[PDB]
Design a protein around this ligand. Structure first.
Ligand SMILES: *C(=O)CC[C@H](NC(=O)CCCCCCCCCCCCCCC)C(=O)O
Length: 31
């Protein structure tokens, strides 16, 4: 019985992975 991945990911969600992933689209083809 062990814990799952979160202690680390909890620090990345602050920036947004999947969501913000879109920011790359606009920035890379929107002026
Ligand atoms: C994090 O990604 C949550 C944001 C969330 N999703 C979206 O906004 C989807 C984007 C579609 C809207 C049209 C694009 C405008 C985005 C511009 C934001 C600044 C990025 C520019 C970087 C140089 C939401 O809040 O709707």
């Amino acid at each position: 019985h062990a814990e799952g991945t979160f202690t680390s990911d909890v620090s990345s969600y602050l920036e947004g992975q999947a969501a913000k992933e879109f920011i790359a689209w606009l920035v890379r083809g929107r002026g």
